[PDB]
Amino acid sequence: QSKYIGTGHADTTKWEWLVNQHRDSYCSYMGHFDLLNYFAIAENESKARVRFNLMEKMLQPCGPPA
Amino acid sequence: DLIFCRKQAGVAIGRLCEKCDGKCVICDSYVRPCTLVRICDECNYGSYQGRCVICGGPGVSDAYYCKECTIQEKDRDGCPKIVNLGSSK
Amino acid sequence: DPFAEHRPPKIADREDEYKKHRRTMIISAEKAKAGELKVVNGAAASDQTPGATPKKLSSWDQAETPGHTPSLRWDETPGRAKGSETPGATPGSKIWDPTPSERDTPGHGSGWAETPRTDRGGDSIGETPTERNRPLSDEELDAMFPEGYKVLPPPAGYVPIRTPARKLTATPTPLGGMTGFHMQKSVNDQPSGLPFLKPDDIQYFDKLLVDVDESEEQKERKIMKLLLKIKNGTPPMRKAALRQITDKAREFGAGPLFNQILPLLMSPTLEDQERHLLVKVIDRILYKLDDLVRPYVHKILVVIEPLLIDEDYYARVEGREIISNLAKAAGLATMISTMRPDIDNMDEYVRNTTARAFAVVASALGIPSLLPFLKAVCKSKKSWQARHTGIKIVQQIAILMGCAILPHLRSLVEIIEHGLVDEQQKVRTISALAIAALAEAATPYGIESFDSVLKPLWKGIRQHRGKGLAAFLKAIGYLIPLMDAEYANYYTREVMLILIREFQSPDEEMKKIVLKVVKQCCGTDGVEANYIKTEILPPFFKHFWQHRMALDRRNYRQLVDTTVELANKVGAAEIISRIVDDLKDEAEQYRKMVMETIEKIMGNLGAADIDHKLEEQLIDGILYAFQEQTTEDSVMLNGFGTVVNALGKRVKPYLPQICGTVLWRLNNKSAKVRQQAADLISRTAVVMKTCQEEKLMGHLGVVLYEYLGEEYPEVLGSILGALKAIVNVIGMHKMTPPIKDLLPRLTPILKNRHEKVQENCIDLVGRIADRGAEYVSAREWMRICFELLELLKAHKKAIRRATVNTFGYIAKAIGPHDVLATLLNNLKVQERQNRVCTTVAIAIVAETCSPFTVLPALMNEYRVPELNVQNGVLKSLSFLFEYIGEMGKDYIYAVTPLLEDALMDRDLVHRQTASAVVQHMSLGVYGFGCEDSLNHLLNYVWPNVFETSPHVIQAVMGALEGLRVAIGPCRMLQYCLQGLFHPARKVRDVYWKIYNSIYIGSQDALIAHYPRIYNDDKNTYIRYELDYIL
Amino acid sequence: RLPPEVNRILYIRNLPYKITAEEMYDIFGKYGPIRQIRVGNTPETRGTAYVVYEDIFDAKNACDHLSGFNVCNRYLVVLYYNANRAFQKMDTKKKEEQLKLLKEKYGI
RNA sequence: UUCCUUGAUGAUGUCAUACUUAUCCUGUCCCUUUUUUUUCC
RNA sequence: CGCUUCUCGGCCAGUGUAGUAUCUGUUCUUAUCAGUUUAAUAUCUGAU
Incomplete structure (x- = not known):
């Protein structure tokens, strides 16, 4: 369980849980080709610049911890 | 004292003895064999060539997984070669 | 003594003279170079310890990368006080000159010990130029006795007679005395007590000869005699007492415990069992205490390590288990800082074992943790004895970690090479030996990592006399498989010579070695057939095949193997031809050997090669052996079976001689040998069939049929077996005892109590009630039912196994209602009966x-x-749904309300088992659209979530996992939200355990189902993406 | 011709709590010179005693004849004392002086 | 303006009895083999 | 020994490893504050 990421425990902080689901949101968005294309259409960029941006936002999302 | 090695899942077909022969390994059960067992030659090697994935005797057959453990997708975790929590021999 | 007779078949000693010291064991950056001059200086002050200094500087080669952990490991090795001082000073000089470009006590006690042995041994060296009985001092005497005793004086006249005693022991040994009895309200019943105390054990449990309360520690010791309830008494006592100690782990603390065990795990008189149990206590409490055990660790191994050197296998495996549990349990630097000094300990034993220890601790904490230590050791320049050890360590690492050694292979070797050239011998010897073991785990690989090793080895091969020599072989041999048969080609061609010249030695270590080699050298693809046929064989069969060998165990095996592989190459008839003539040599174990060898060979190569005349010699042989069997052993029997099934219809002329013996034997010779011949039929059925010798099938059918009245179980079993296999060849309607006769004839046997019967019978009944099943009028069956029913008292699994499957077969023959009505007969009043198989x-x-x-x-x-x-x-x-699967899409409704009732309490068990029903249903239905109900049930399930009762819980985990796949997450997760953060601990414990189980599977699905979450000051928890609208 | 376990020590029990070193020294005195004795003077070990001789075979003769021997109305449990165990209350040491001494006089 | 009996837990006790795991009741011996190198056309 | 006649008799209290559930007995609702602890209690730890 532990070496399988996204594992929680009862000490789980708010922040960590949410950052988790961010990241996983992302590897989905890189995953599901369409969903990606959806984003691309909306906010006009490349597919690439999308994926790139995302892979920037990976570690950050929500901003610094507490 | 008795728990999985869960080292990475190789291509080596599993091997079971007389005793263990029917059992879908994790669901302990005879029901509905469908799909096939893989373990690491690390787990499975040498004196372990055709060794029981349980008891330490010679393998006469090949464990099939249940369907139950199938849809719960467990068969794909680390190689179910049970280690006694002493060494494996 | 007779009690010394039936008590010695209780337990037994098992041990050599050698292993009996156990009784003796009393309890517990060029300025990086000139820097090494510095480090050496300062530590040397804080004398002479080597491999310490080397564990220090051994953090060099990762350069830039060495850290705090240096203070950790070193922190234990030296007194953690000086620690800070040094490693601090170091980190300073290192960062700077990087710019500008009790333990100690313990070892002291060792150097003591050997300095002493030097004083004495030298005293009889000049005294010879001129033990336990060694006299004693009062300082020493007080320490040995526990606390709480006065020394005395009776009188200086009293102690003067004592002083007079020896001189007057000879003097008054020769003087007058004899003793005279006279012919002529007692009291004082001594309390000797509480399950029971052997006489010897008084010494331990003596304090249970006192009867008091109100003494506090001493109430903890005096309460820890719960042991005795472990050591001796009834099984239930052992159990309950055992847990009571487990939960009392944290409390009493290790110190008191091990203080009170290790005497017993040291007991000169200890059993088997008592040993094994007291191990159990050491493991079990070692699942708990972690930081705690530190001061005790060595003070443990000293008992345990001898476990490694035991005749009993299961002994060993326990031992290893706990030495990991300790080592991982304690800290690494604990283990090390502990275990140096045993390296140079005079006794080779304690080294030897000490290695296997380090093997285990290394399996625990990984090699690379431990390397720089080893690598330090093998470069210790004080003395070799270490290096002999450190190398050994490499080995037992090899053996244990085995196939997994692979990655650090190169490093390990990079240790061990510097041995081979050493001045001392052993160190050479053992070294090479390790290389061997390595390769034997390196199969096949890492060849060039061994690479720089060879060129000495080959040269070394030339010049040697002795055990070492053949050792180097042990290596090379295990190498060759690893080479390129062009390079390997050459090098092979050199060895097979020395191999030749060396068959002949008297050494057995040798013959093992050279043997296994040939397996490999001529065990090769890139070696030429004839060449073996000429040079090797005739020696081979000459010197090896001899009665020395096979009596021993290993040699037996290793032999068989080797000869087999020479077959896999030069062919079959070659070998078998030469060893046939020895089935008729008298002594068994030998015969047994030739027999199994052949068996394999015609296993692998196939019969097809064999000529004719030779073959006559086979079957004549394989009978002649088979006719004389000391015990009944699988060997000759199988070996035969394979013989026949290989020969196929080449066999046919030979039957009459077979079945002739088969019968003749079958009878008389009194019954012990009977079952054998029976089996012999079992296996040769198929051959009696396809060739179409039917008169034979008349014979067997009917004459076996008669024995089924045989009263010995161990015959009748094999008898039936034969019948079964006879059925699998000749169909029902051609059965010569046509079933009508038979099947009832079986029927009453089912009482038989004895095992092998119940097995082969129910097996048989099964085959026939499956296949023919019409032959027998219904009434008979229903008798069979009401007889089966209590076969479900079987201690064994397999019986019940096929038992059930039969129950089905007949249930087909008749039709259901009754047979469940009949099964429905099992009741709640008893239990063990109709436990479940029903x-x-x-x-x-x-x-x-x-x-x-x-x-x-x-x-x-x-x-x-x-x-x-x-x-x-x-x-x-x-089980019902588990066995039906898809079909559940119907009767689901039927059960659902019932599941509601049962699932609502009466008691746990209702909720447990029922919940399981939910599981197998929930998988089976999957995705046919019946969810709705399953949602409904989910409710009455849900509250069960909370309980400690292991079966109830792992049941429920079963439930909700399956239910996940049926309902889908999103619904689940909608039960698991609120739980996560609930203030309490209890709930969070669980709702997390659930949400994990939901989480691992179907992580990919979730994304949708995390709800919106409002972003706070420092952060944004709203995922803005999804709301982009075209 | 001896079992290895037995040692110059014997555990000795079934004693009265009045009983005399005079009695003791005398009786045990038969087999050989006493290295020394201890008597449990303590709440628990009142009733028992240890005995140690200048030789084992002394003690062997002891556990031989004194086996189950009588004193007062009592029978004395007579046992070869175990060893190792709890002693390490006293740390190993005291070498340095002494082994320098043999180092000195005899020079050896 | 001058009046009744009662419920319940928790903690500590080696009492008592039901029961749970297709657990268990047969597999199983194999690298413990250790010594101051020392087997002669 | 065979045949015929007559008389009598026969048959269609197992064991081992892990673990839970449930009764009864015994002790406490009893003075303040300081820490540990708990969802909150409780419980545990000190002195008047």
Whole structure:
């Protein structure tokens, strides 16, 4: 369980849980080709610049911890 | 004292003895064999060539997984070669 | 003494002279170079310790990368006080000159010990130029005795007579005395007590010769005699007492414990069992205490390590288990800082074992943790004895970690090379030996990592005399498989010579070695056939095949192997030809050997090669052996079977001689040998068939049929077996004892109590009631039913196994209602009976006609007030759905309300088993669209979540996992939100455990189902993406 | 011709709590010179005693004849004392002086 | 303006009895083999 | 020994490893504050 990421425990902080689901949101968005294309259409960029941006936002999302 | 090695899942077909022969390994059960067992030659090697994935005797057959453990997708975790929590021999 | 007779078949010593020291064991950056001059200086002050300094500087080669951990490991090795001082000073000089470009006590006690042995041994060296009885000092005497005793004086006249005693022991040994009895309100019953105290054990449990309260520590010791309830007494006592100690782990603390065990795990008189149990206590408490055990660690191994050197296998494996549990349990630097000084300990034993220790601790904490230590050791320049050890360590690492050694292979070797050239011998010897073991785990690989090793080895091969020599072989041999048969080609061609010249030695270590080699050298693809045929064989069969060998165990095996592989190459008839003539050599173990060898060979190569005349010599042989069997052993029997099934219809001329013996033997010779011949038929059935010797099938059918009145179990068993295999060849309607005769004839046997019977019988009955099953009028069957029913008292699994499957077969023959009505007979009043396998009948039955029939009977039968049969019916549903799968899409409704009732309490068990039903249903239905109900049930499940009761819980985990796949997450997760953060601990514990189980599977799905979450000051928890609208 | 376990020590029990070193020294005195004795003077070990001789075979003759021997109305449990165990209350040491001494006089 | 009996837990006790795991009741011996190198056309 | 006649008799209290559930007995609702602890209690730890 532990070496399988996204594992929680009862000490789980708010922040960590949410950052988790961010990241996983992302590897989905890189995953599901369409969903990606959806984003691309909306906010006009490349597919690439999308994926790139995302892979920037990976570690950050929500901003610094507490 | 008795728990999985869960080292990475190789291509080596599993091997079971007389005793263990029917059992879908994790669901302990005879029901509905469908799909096939893989373990690491690390787990499975040498004196372990055709060794029981349980008891330490010679393998006469090949464990099939249940369907139950199938849809719960467990068969794909680390190689179910049970280690006694002493060494494996 | 006779009590010394039946008490010695209780337990027994098992040990050599050698292993009996156990009794003796009393309890517990060029300025990086000139820097090494510095480090050496300062530590040397804080004398002479080597491999310390090397564990220090051994953090060099990762350069830039060495850290705090240096203070950790070193922190234990030296007194953690000086630690800070040094490693601090170091880190300073290192960062800077990086710019500008009790333990100690313990070892002291060792150098003591050997300085002493030097003083004495030298005293008889000049005294010879001129033990336990060694006299004693009062300082020493006080320490040995525990606390709490006065020394005395009776009188200086009293102690003067004592002083006079020896001189007057000879003097008054020769003087006058004799003793005279005279012919002529007692009291004082001594309390010797509480399960029981052997006489010897008084010494330990003496304080249970006192009877008091109000003494506090001493109340903890005096309460820890719970042991004795471990050591001796009744099984239940052992159990309960055992837990009571486990939960009292944290409390009493290790110190008191091990203080009170290690005497017993040291007991000169200890058993087997008592040993093994007291191990159990050491493991079990070692699942708990972690930081705690530190001061005790060595003070443990000293007992345990001897476990490594034991005749009993299961002994060893326990030992290893706990030495990991300790080592991982304690800290690494604990283990090290502990275990240096045993390296140079005079006794080779303690080294030897000390290695295997380090092997284990290394399996625990990984090699690379431990390397720089080893690598330090093998470069210790004080003395070799270490290096002998450190190398050994490499080995036992090799053996244990085995196939997994692979990655650090190169480093390990990079240790060990510097040995081979050493001045001392052993160190050479052992070294190479390790290389061997390595390669034997390196199969096949890492060749060039060994690479720089060879060129000495080959040269070394030339010049040697002795055990070392053949050792180097042990290596090379295990190498060759690893080479390129062009390079390997050459090098091979060199060895097979020395191999030749060396067959002949008297050494057995040798013959093992050179043997296994040939397996490999001529065990090769890139070696030429004839060449073996000429040079090797005739020696081989000459010197090796001899009666020395086979009596021993290993040599037996290793031999068989080798000869086999020479077959796999030069062919079959070659070998077998030469060893046939020895089936008729008298002594068994030998015969047994030739026999199994052949068996394999015609296993692998196939019969097809064999000529004719030789073959006559086979079968004549394989009878002649088979006719004389000391015990009944699988060997000759199988070996035969394979012989025949290989020869196929080449066999046919030979039957009459076979079956002739088969019968003749079969009779007389009194019954012990009978079962054998029986089996012999078992295996050769198929051959009696396809060739179409039917008169034979008349013979067997009927004459076996007679024995089924034989009273010995161990015959009748094999008899039936023969019958079964006879059935699998000749079909039903051609059976010469036509079934009508037979099947009833069996029927009454089922009482037989004895095992092998019940097995082969129910097996047989099964085959026939499956296949023919019409032959026998129904009435007979229903008799069979009411006889089966109590076969379910079987201690064994397999009986019940096929038992059930039969129960089904007949249930097909007749039709269901009755047979479940009949199964439905098992009741809640008893329990062990109709424990479950019966339920399994209800299941399989319920398939084998449309279950769609049977339910109403079943369901209704949950009405009955008798509790345990109620839960029975629940499981019935369980296995039931597990066995039906898709079909559940119907009767689901039927059960659902019932699941509601049972799932609502009466008691746990209802909720447990029922919940299981939910599981197997929930998988089976999957995605046909019946969720709705399953949602409904989810409710009555849900509250069960909370309990400690292991079966109830792992049941529920079962439930919700399956239910996940049926309902889908999103619904689940909608039960698991609120739980996560709930203030309490209890709930969070669980709702997390659930949400994990949801989480791992279907992580990919979730994304949708995390709800919106409002972003706070420092952060944004709203995922803005999804709201982009075109 | 001896079992290895037995040692110059014997555990000795079934004693009265009045009983005399005079009695003791005398009786045990038969087999050989006493290295020394201890008597449990303590709440628990009142009733028992240890005995140690200048030789084992002394003690062997002891556990031989004194086996189950009588004193007062009592029978004395007579056992070869175990060893190792709890002693390490006293740390190993005291070498340095002494082994320098043999180092010195005899020079060896 | 001058009046009744009662419920319940928790903690500590080696009492008592039901029961749970297709657990268990047969597999199983194999690298413990250790010594101051020392087997002669 | 065979045949015929007559008389009598026969048959269609197992064991081992892990673990839970449930009764009864015994002790406490009893003075303040400081820490540990708990969802909150409780419980545990000190002195008047």
